[PDB]
Symmetry: D2
Subunit: 181 residues, 4 copies
């Protein structure tokens, strides 16, 4: 039944947040403290991800500029298609990190599995630039969680389902924004 | 402290979802049914909204087009938004695209956390003018958008004051509707 | 010298347009006629391309939607572009949206300065499988795209080696097509 | 006749470039030199405009990034739609200049008439932030042309029609990028 299906979506979304609340409070505060340190020293925040996580990158960037220095790397479609066509899709965010990023800025990489190849490249590029990284991941954190440093902050939602991971990410993003102001 | 602030966001968001669960289950089915009827008659679904709701509109569209379903977000063509904003005024940026793309039987999904967004209101008017049905994703009391709706439209009002919690519930409603559609 | 370099750009751009003037008047008319036929039979035009051509696609669509005409650029929804690129692969970013939105009688305008863009090629296939007609905006010799067209499609090839000159002729061509549609 | 109209479009575009070729060489060179000075001192370049000029701002930025610091302010549709709705459409570019701009950076403002209100606000915010400005205008340069300082650079295409001004802007953009590339 569609009524039971919908109700099962609500129940699962409540179970995932209850599960997430007990582990994600301290990391989220560390993420917002990292962004405040970046912003208070004339830095800026770059954000990226794919699909619904690309939507979440521009949502976050719009909260900040609506003013605080934040740019989503998922919005310039000439850039995404030029790079996608000539260099390959794995490089669409990294090349923008290399273009805009400077020492002391923060990268917010978003990937529900933690294995998004283009987010992986962007994190690598951020490290070469001496930028800090905040990874919004799900499941076990994937390759992205393994490649982080002690100076980075991991926000892993432990739930296997992508829809549930996205929902927690937008909540994490609203908590960080409210912490910052 | 910052710890207590984050903790409270989580708890507020759990509560918002527990209260939403009690009133939004049957309307979410109506909306999903309304989209199935449209897509099975070779119709398409147009989505629009502002800020976070603009992010929601394109999130929705991408999960439809990613078999491939007919959905277009009206919040993505930046040559269209800025041209219509600059020349005709920002209140007409969605309504004009409804007049370009909309056809009888299509569905407009309009997203407004307050229910009062001038450009989504104009888009609702336009969608009615072209014999389209409307799924309004609103918050608070539903605003002007809820007052405009016909009996053939479906209202999904998130009963909550804070924008952030309304956006969070809107994305849950979208995931629920998409999964009902996939299920058929 | 920067003065001579800039001068050379203008002169080269003038030369490029004088040559296209000799051989692109009749095809441009055929392309516009095809779009008028499609629009008058309640159809729509989909546009796609990479880089500067992505900009051209959304420029074209924005001048159609600003009465309002049915035209969607497939290069604007970043959730769709990034979802399909990540999940399936970059070569299906346009072809999947064509399968979502396209119907019989619609028109795909594929823009590609070499005629060899992998994602624009895959889009042409999907348009053919949907019984849509194609208008290719290409450069150089027309690449694989020019080779791929049916009798009922229209090739607008800019016979020039340099990408920058090809883009500049493409936007002229678009403007001339939009004005021909306006006149009817 | 459609053939005659298209022919007239090619002829008018060649005439407009011949007219533009004889005044814009020196200014274009000064614009490229300004950009090089910005970049070489670790600055970045911001671009904005409406309609086709938003396409051009996006085009420009993409040729810099694929690497040089350039951002179009026309691309984040969540930001454009929030600011349009909450604060008003005149502030969509200026608010982003306030967010991102730093002393010594360059704003590229693109406007076919010189009278785009949101570009005017962008120019104003840029001067308060000690940024230099390259204005791509047409006709007489409008309010934007009167507003510029000695340290800025006007690139005015003297032609009445919007299509012809746009075509020339994309040429100017290609000339500037090639000047910047030749120096590095
Ligand atoms: Zn999703
Ligand atoms: Zn929000
Ligand atoms: Zn170009
Ligand atoms: Zn134009």
């Amino acid at each position: 039944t569609l009524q039971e299906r919908v109700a099962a979506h609500f129940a699962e979304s409540i179970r995932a947040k209850q599960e997430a609340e007990k582990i994600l409070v301290e990391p989220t505060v560390q993420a917002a403290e990292l962004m405040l340190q970046c912003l208070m020293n004339d830095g800026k925040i770059l954000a990226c991800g794919n699909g619904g996580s690309a939507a979440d990158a521009q949502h976050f960037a719009a909260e900040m500029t609506g003013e605080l220095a934040a740019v989503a790397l998922t919005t310039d479609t000439s850039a995404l298609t030029a790079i996608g066509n000539d260099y390959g899709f794995d490089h669409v965010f990294s090349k923008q990190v290399r273009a805009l990023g400077r020492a002391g800025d923060v990268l917010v990489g978003i990937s529900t599995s933690g294995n998004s190849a283009n987010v992986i490249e962007a994190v690598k590029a951020a490290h070469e630039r001496d930028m800090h990284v905040i990874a919004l991941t799900g499941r076990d954190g994937g390759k992205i969680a393994a490649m982080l440093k002690d100076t980075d902050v991991l926000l892993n939602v432990p739930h296997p389902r992508t829809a549930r991971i996205q929902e927690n990410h937008i909540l994490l993003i609203h908590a960080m924004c409210d912490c910052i102001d």
